[PDB]
Every structure is written in structure tokens, then in C-alpha cells.
Amino acid sequence: KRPWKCCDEAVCTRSIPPICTCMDEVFECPKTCKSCGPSMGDPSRRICQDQYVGDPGPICRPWECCDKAICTRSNPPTCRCVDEVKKCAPTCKTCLPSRSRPSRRVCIDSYFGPVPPRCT
């Protein structure tokens, strides 16, 4: 079936259906993946190499984008996001109301993965 359950870095064609590669770095080859191997010319940055045809599925990370990411220095880093949003992403585990913007919420999750895209 699909070689991943979720993908943070899906590179897909704008076609029906999409043709997709998941560029997410892996630390062990997922059971759903046919083969893992290097990426970005880096022998140590391993990915699921499989091309998939079909909807790539959801992101893994707890925020689609973040304008206020705070991350460690590792590659990949561990990051949190202090954006105050109308609704946390479905993939956020712990969402709390904001003190300063009472109609907004904050996701307090920490997540190990590449710096998320900026929202703005």
C-alpha cells in the first residue's frame, strides 16, 4: 500500500492522482517501505526511496507551518512552535488556550524533525 502513514516533506506532482516521493529522513527503514537509501547527496540522510502514486496523506508534525519556531541545533532539530492560532493542527497532541489572545490557542508539542515551513 502507501509506503508511509504520514509525510512531512512530500514532493508531489499536481496531477490526479499525484505522483509522490516522501523526503522525510528516517532512522530505521519503516516496515511499510520497500527500500530506504541516501538523499540530498548525503550518504547518512536516509529516506524511504519508494515512489507512490496517490494522495500522500497527512503531515506528521504538529503544525502545518510556524512563524515562531524555537529549535535545537541538531540536524534534524527538535522544535516547538509558539504561534497563537485559531485552531491547532489535528496532529497537535496538546493544545491550550492563549493567555494574550483569548480567541487563539497554542500547541505545546515538541517535535523531532526539520524546521517547519514559515506560515508567512
The domain locations on the chain are: 1-60, 61-120
**CA 47, CA 32: separation in Å to the nearest integer?**
12
Method: X-ray
Tell me the sheet residues that pair with 52.
20
Tell me the sheet residues that pair with 79.
71, 111
The three cell numbers of residue 25 are 529522513
Buried residues in 95-115 as b, exposed as e (16+ CB within 10 A): beeeeeeeeebbbebebebbe
**CA 56, CA 6: separation in Å to the nearest integer?**
7
Just give the CATH number of 61-120: 2.10.69.10
Tell me the resolution in Å: 1.2
- Residue 104 one-letter amino acid: R
Other Cβ atoms closer than 10 A to 41:
6
How many residues does the structure list for the chain?
120
Q: Where are the beta strands (DSSP E) in 42-86?
A: 42-48, 51-53, 69-71, 78-81
Other Cβ atoms closer than 10 A to 59:
20
The CATH superfamily holding the domain 1-60 is Cysteine Protease (Bromelain) Inhibitor, subunit H (2.10.69.10)
Other Cβ atoms closer than 10 A to 49:
16
| Cβ–Cβ < 8 Å for 4, 24 | yes
99 alpha-carbon distance from chain centroid: 27
Identify the residue whose cell numbers are 517501505.
Answer: 33
